[PDB]
Write a protein that binds this ligand. Structure first.
Ligand SMILES: CCCCCCCC/C=C\CCCCCCCC(=O)O[C@H](COC(=O)CCCCCCCCCCCCCCC)COP(=O)([O-])OCC[N+](C)(C)C
Ligand SMILES: CCCCCCCC/C=C\CCCCCCCC(=O)O[C@H](COC(=O)CCCCCCCCCCCCCCC)COP(=O)([O-])OCC[N+](C)(C)C
Ligand SMILES: CCCCCCCC/C=C\CCCCCCCC(=O)O[C@H](COC(=O)CCCCCCCCCCCCCCC)COP(=O)(O)OCCN
Ligand SMILES: CCCCCCCC/C=C\CCCCCCCC(=O)O[C@H](COC(=O)CCCCCCCCCCCCCCC)COP(=O)(O)OCCN
Ligand SMILES: CCCCCCCC/C=C\CCCCCCCC(=O)O[C@H](COC(=O)CCCCCCCCCCCCCCC)COP(=O)(O)OCCN
Ligand SMILES: CCCCCCCC/C=C\CCCCCCCC(=O)O[C@H](COC(=O)CCCCCCCCCCCCCCC)COP(=O)(O)OCCN
Ligand SMILES: CCCCCCCC/C=C\CCCCCCCC(=O)O[C@H](COC(=O)CCCCCCCCCCCCCCC)COP(=O)(O)OCCN
Ligand SMILES: CCCCCCCC/C=C\CCCCCCCC(=O)O[C@H](COC(=O)CCCCCCCCCCCCCCC)COP(=O)(O)OCCN
Ligand SMILES: CCCCCCCC/C=C\CCCCCCCC(=O)O[C@H](COC(=O)CCCCCCCCCCCCCCC)COP(=O)(O)OCCN
Ligand SMILES: CCCCCCCC/C=C\CCCCCCCC(=O)O[C@H](COC(=O)CCCCCCCCCCCCCCC)COP(=O)(O)OCCN
Ligand SMILES: CCCCCCCC/C=C\CCCCCCCC(=O)O[C@H](COC(=O)CCCCCCCCCCCCCCC)COP(=O)(O)OCCN
Ligand SMILES: *C(=S)NCc1ccccc1
Lengths: 440, 270
């Protein structure tokens, strides 16, 4: 495709082609009612090609030029103002409403559980009428509505997850967000069920704890779609996967030190069991060694069996785990964060264009014809609509030697070709030249 | 233009609060309000006084690195809010019978204090377990190991990696930024002074004696000691020379074709 070939091969001509799409009104009247017009005729195919996979029978994607510019890493073209206004129009068309609906359903699930936790003392069995101790009134109207909201949100989450099962067709097995949602909705069901079926308070609060943990832990995954927080979520992902790869070294090293301290320091209560000794060394990992309480004061009271071996184990633990292993994790984290911030400005716009090109494949085509626009008119003097809340929302959440030497090499190759032709002409001159009075 | 400016806000807080700390010479004020204002004022005076070190040449680089790290820490705050609220409400449900986790707000403040690594394992987890005072002990220890992995290991190393990257980015351009701040200071200050003072104070030439020290050797010298102190262009020149070379070679090729066009061929034809 010639536009995609221009993006692949000569992007500095695609820049000029996009410069013809930008229009202006008057250079002197730039403050008084001034406008600029953006035309998006070269950035996408017509809509009747894109969603017509059976009947047009040609491969198409929505946002053709943007996907071609992302696959070829042409970031100076993604930062062109025509492309910026194209994504901004595409977000104001259907991306904002779809994302706020997707966030609003989950937040409707999220808020009543936190209200219900911070308004009820844990450990006590509570029911639609109140809290069983006698019954506690004066909050039952709030408690009943919050339990109904959590119950309805959990069953609609089941229906949405079953729809994603019967649509995704077994690609959803190795996916973390599905597993987190299964845990959230099952556990939030069990926390609320005493309005139907009586449950002991121990099981009820044991489920409430897990649910209130995983709701807010899952709610970090919805910050990845925004432009400010997605880079923190992807750096946290990279550091956490790097920490997962290194876990067997933790297991072996920690099990060595834990069983050694279990044999050495057996008479003390933190090292009574082997499992408690393992958990204690895991807590000592950061540097909370407890030298005076566990090593010195038993030594001065003659309560250490094997004291020399115990202090040698202490200095060996202090050298290996809090010095060496923690600095290893710090060096790995510094390297990974530098690697991620090397490619941040491309990754942001790539996530946005992937979000829109994934969302557009599911919407119906009449809605696409209704909502899209071919041109946008921008007034720099006039602010955008919805100045009260939407402006604060957009402030808070939204925002070369190689090619030179390659051109050098092309010019030098043209130079040596011309010089070869010229050398052939000079040999032809000497072949046809007339030599009189210079022979012999 | 002064609305989105931090130094104006700090000065409003400083001067209002220092007024209220002193007003018992005019109007009698209870001692509680007076010392409540004195605390805020003595905090913000010395906290504001860092902003005046930015004009000097030695300390301005530390003030701008501290600015960069602090803005980077401000951008990441919603991750702190969500993660800390998750762990705080989880510990509030789990460890409810203990005094640091009696309220949800106290539980949130306690997890914020546990952030750095002051976990209090023996006092809050072990010794209640040995006295059978933990409800849900397995879930409690699982929450403990999950908290130890997420917040002091992962999140703190993330902040360290971001700080290392930002400080490297700032020290990449330090020597230009120092002189740029000095020349911006002088070119901003000169627009407000009157013109007769400018004609009075400026000089066209300066004479420097390397053998003779500058005037005010006692205090001003110690003050000036304490507070004051390429491949791309080469390949571009390469490209210009090569372009001139190919232009000359084209002219020469045209001359050689003209030679063959006008040449006289006798006894070499056919
Ligand atoms: C003695 C003991 C020693 C042990 C040492 C062990 C050391 C080992 C340590 C850690 C290994 C375990 C880490 C688990 C998840 C890592 C993978 C992951 O999320 O990356 C990716 C996202 O990453 C993110 O950005 C998400 C980050 C937040 C998720 C938090 C949930 C975890 C809660 C669990 C707590 C359970 C505790 C319960 C207790 C009650 C997801 O993977 P992906 O498919 O690439 O991306 C798809 C993303 N979309 C498209 C779906 C959006
Ligand atoms: C559970 C809780 C969890 C919460 C997590 C929260 C995590 C979030 C953390 C932090 C976010 C808040 C940071 C506030 C300021 C950051 C912006 C800033 O100063 O940068 C710039 C300078 O930067 C500097 O170099 C100045 C540095 C010193 C200023 C210190 C004053 C702060 C005192 C507040 C303490 C209040 C406490 C009161 C209590 C009594 C100023 O901005 P600028 O316009 O670019 O430059 C103009 C500079 N000139 C020209 C004016 C000179
Ligand atoms: C997010 C938006 C939700 C905000 C609505 C919360 C109002 C509930 C509230 O204040 O109840 C009061 C308690 O407030 C809370 O602590 C609710 C905490 C939920 C915060 C989650 C966000 C009850 O006090 P009283 O009966 O007036 O005496
Ligand atoms: C307790 C532990 C529960 C945590 C399990 C969740 C881990 C899932 C991450 C995973 O498998 O990612 C894969 C990484 O695999 C690993 O190295 C995980 C190692 C864990 C082994 C511990 C036994 C591939 O990453 P990606 O899909 O490119 O992103
Ligand atoms: C390197 C990986 C090897 C780690 C596996 C060690 C687990 C052995 C273990 O704890 O065995 C028994 C199992 O204890 C438990 O409750 C679960 C143990 C799982 C620990 C695995 C964590 C390693 C990382 C402990 O028995 P006891 O407390 O001495 O009382 C017995 C009364 N009849
Ligand atoms: C890579 C090198 C690893 C070396 C492995 C050996 C263990 C590491 C120990 C280092 C300690 C450094 C200096 C300590 C010198 C103290 C001398 C002394 O009199 O203490 C004595 C030192 O105790 C010991 O550590 C002796 C070890 C006995 C184990 C016997 C068999 C192990 C030898 C391995 C043979 C392999 C040789 C291959 C080469 C006993 O004092 P106590 O423990 O206070 O008992 C009194 C009970 N109330
Ligand atoms: C390696 C360099 C080792 C340097 C010095 C080790 C000298 C210790 C051996 C004998 C000390 C006897 C003893 O009970 O020491 C007591 C305990 O001190 C110790 O045993 C310290 C042992 C430190 C061993 C360090 C070697 C481990 C190095 C591994 C690093 C691998 C990474 C206290 O001494 P005191 O208060 O003077 O008591 C006098 C009353 N009799
Ligand atoms: C308690 C909190 C009070 C702290 C408020 C002071 C923050 C002002 C910094 C600011 O707005 O800078 C702007 C940065 O905006 C942010 O990301 C601040 C995020 C804080 C959100 C918390 C709610 C632009 O920086 P600059 O003007 O280029 O230098
Ligand atoms: C993620 C962001 C959500 C954070 C909002 C949670 C605040 C809920 C809260 O503390 O509600 C009530 C408000 O408590 C306060 O004094 C201020 C709470 C503000 C906390 C916000 C900090 C989050 C970061 C606590 O009620 P109580 O102590 O149980 O006693 C009630 C007696 N009638
Ligand atoms: C990403 C993976 C997250 C998994 C989420 C589940 C919670 C994480 C827990 C991990 C623990 C690892 C090994 C522990 C095994 C111990 C077995 C055992 O006998 O303990 C038992 C373990 O307790 C539990 O944690 C059971 C949890 C009950 C909640 C029931 C409903 C939640 C299940 C979710 C279903 C979703 C499935 C989707 C796939 C009870 O002992 P206790 O708490 O000491 O109570 C005695 C009171 N005096
Ligand atoms: C993941 C690998 C998990 C490894 C081992 C878990 C084995 C614990 C289950 C059953 C232990 C029963 C128990 O009460 O343990 C007691 C408490 O220990 C625990 O429950 C430790 C639980 C650790 C769970 C770790 C899994 C969380 C991983 C999430 C990381 C995500 C990042 C003490 O044991 P004991 O002194 O041997 O008592 C014996 C007298 N009956
Ligand atoms: C191939 S013909 N390029 C795609 C395209 C995009 C916009 C307008 C025309 C063509």
């Amino acid at each position: 495709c010639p536009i995609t070939e221009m993006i692949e091969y000569l992007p500095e001509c695609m820049k000029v082609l996009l410069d013809f799409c930008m229009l202006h009104s008057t250079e002197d009247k730039s403050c008084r009612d001034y406008y600029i017009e953006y035309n998006f005729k070269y950035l996408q195919c017509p809509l009747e090609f894109t969603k017509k996979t059976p009947t047009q029978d040609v491969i198409y994607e929505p946002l053709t030029a943007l996907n071609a510019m992302v696959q070829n890493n042409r970031i100076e073209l993604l930062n062109h103002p025509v492309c910026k206004e194209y994504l901004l129009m595409k977000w104001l068309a259907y991306g904002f409403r779809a994302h706020m609906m997707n966030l609003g359903s989950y937040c409707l699930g999220l808020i009543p559980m936190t209200i219900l936790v911070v308004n009820i003392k844990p450990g006590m069995a509570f029911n639609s009428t109140g809290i069983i101790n006698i019954l506690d009134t004066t909050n039952s109207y709030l408690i009943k509505t919050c339990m109904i909201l959590v119950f309805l949100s959990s069953i609609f989450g089941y229906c949405k997850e079953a729809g994603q099962i019967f649509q995704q067709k077994r690609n959803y097995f190795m996916d973390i967000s599905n597993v987190l949602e299964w845990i959230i909705y099952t556990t939030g069901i069990i926390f609320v069920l005493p309005l139907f079926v009586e449950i002991p308070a121990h099981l009820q609060w044991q489920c409430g704890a897990i649910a209130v943990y995983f709701y807010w832990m899952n709610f970090l995954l919805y910050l990845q779609r925004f432009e400010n927080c997605g880079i923190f979520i992807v750096m946290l992902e990279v550091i956490l996967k790097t920490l997962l790869r290194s876990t067997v070294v933790f297991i072996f090293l920690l099990l060595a030190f834990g069983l050694s301290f279990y044999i050495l320091l057996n008479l003390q209560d933190p090292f009574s069991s082997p499992l408690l000794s393992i958990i204690q060394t895991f807590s000592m990992m950061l540097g909370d060694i407890n030298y005076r309480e566990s090593f010195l004061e038993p030594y001065l009271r003659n309560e250490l069996a094997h004291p020399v071996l115990s202090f040698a184990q202490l200095v060996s633990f202090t050298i290996f785990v809090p010095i060496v292993l923690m600095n290893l994790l710090i060096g790995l984290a510094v390297g990974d964060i530098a690697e991620v911030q090397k490619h941040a400005s491309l990754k942001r716009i790539a996530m946005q264009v992937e979000l829109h090109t994934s969302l557009e494949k599911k919407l119906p085509l009449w809605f696409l014809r209704k909502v899209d626009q071919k041109s946008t008119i921008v007034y720099p003097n006039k602010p955008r609509s919805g100045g009260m809340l939407f402006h604060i929302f957009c402030f808070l959440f939204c925002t070369s030697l190689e090619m030179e030497i390659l051109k050098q090499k092309y010019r030098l190759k043209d130079l040596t070709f011309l010089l070869e032709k010229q050398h052939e002409l000079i040999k032809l001159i000497i072949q046809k030249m007339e030599i009189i009075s210079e022979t012999e």
